[PDB]
Amino acid sequence: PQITLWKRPLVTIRIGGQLKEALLDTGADDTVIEEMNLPGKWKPKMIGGIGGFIKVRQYDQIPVEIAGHKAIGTVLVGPTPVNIIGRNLLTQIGATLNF
Amino acid sequence: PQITLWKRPLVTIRIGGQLKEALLDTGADDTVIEEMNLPGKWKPKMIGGIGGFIKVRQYDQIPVEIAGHKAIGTVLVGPTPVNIIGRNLLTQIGATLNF
Numbered sequence: 503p504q505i506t507l508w509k510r511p512l513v514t515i516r517i518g519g520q521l522k523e524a525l526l527d528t529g530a531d532d533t534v535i536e537e538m539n540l541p542g543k544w545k546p547k548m549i550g551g552i553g554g555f556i557k558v559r560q561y562d563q564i565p566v567e568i569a570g571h572k573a574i575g576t577v578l579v580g581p582t583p584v585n586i587i588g589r590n591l592l593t594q595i596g597a598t599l600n601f
Numbered sequence: 602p603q604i605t606l607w608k609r610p611l612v613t614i615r616i617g618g619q620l621k622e623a624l625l626d627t628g629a630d631d632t633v634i635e636e637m638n639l640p641g642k643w644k645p646k647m648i649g650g651i652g653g654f655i656k657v658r659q660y661d662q663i664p665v666e667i668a669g670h671k672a673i674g675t676v677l678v679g680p681t682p683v684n685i686i687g688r689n690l691l692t693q694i695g696a697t698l699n700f
């Protein structure tokens with residue numbers, strides 16, 4: 503689809519067999535999801551954004567369906583205000599910025 | 602133009618007479634520029650991102666040219682590692698997400 507920016511670009515995603523709302527964030531290198539139980543092994547990791555660094559659990563090669571489009575990649579789970587779909591998954595579904 | 606997301610979508614902006622590199626961020630409600638001495642009246646405010654909140658100064662009606670596209674709106678100045686162009690200015694240059 504073509505998504506305008508008058509509102510936050512929120513879409514539904516399916517991850518771990520569960521549906522959630524996530525923000526398509528081109529300013530995010532990675533995908534950060536709110537705390538949840540995800541099947542698979544995880545490595546502790548630290549990432550930083552505007553207000554600082556947080557600790558996250560890194561899950562690799564996790565299938566994520568974004569608006570019906572499939573991606574299989576790394577997702578970080580940790581304390582976040584909102585589910586963020588970053589560049590690592592946006593590139594898999596062929597998302598581009600246009601103006 | 603069409604910007605792919607293989608790399609951070611960084612473009613040149615012009616603000617306050619200066620040229621800077623800034624990240625096009627669809628996940629940002631506001632525009633945050635790195636600490637600069639912009640003249641004008643400002644109001645204090647706190648914005649949060651991943652990790653927490655930072656104090657910034659809010660300037661209104663600031664002319665910003667993005668990739669040769671003119672826009673004008675609120676710009677927050679504060680200690681950010683990178684300049685961030687948020688939706689408040691992206692909508693003005695007709696930017697859309699497409700996949």
Ligand SMILES: CC[C@H](C)[C@@H]1NC(=O)[C@@H](NC[C@@H](O)[C@H](Cc2ccccc2)NC(=O)OC(C)(C)C)Cc2ccc(cc2)OCCCNC1=O
Nearest residue numbers: 529530531532549550551552583628629630648649650651
């Ligand atoms: C500072 C930008 C803007 C103010 C802020 N947006 C944001 O910070 C959104 N984009 C994240 C991007 O703005 C930053 C840019 C950056 C890059 C490198 C170093 C530092 C910062 N990237 C970023 O945080 O990448 C992570 C998620 C992988 C850690 C993600 C988000 C959305 C809503 C959030 C919290 C976070 O909570 C909602 C509150 C509204 N906050 C916002 O809209």
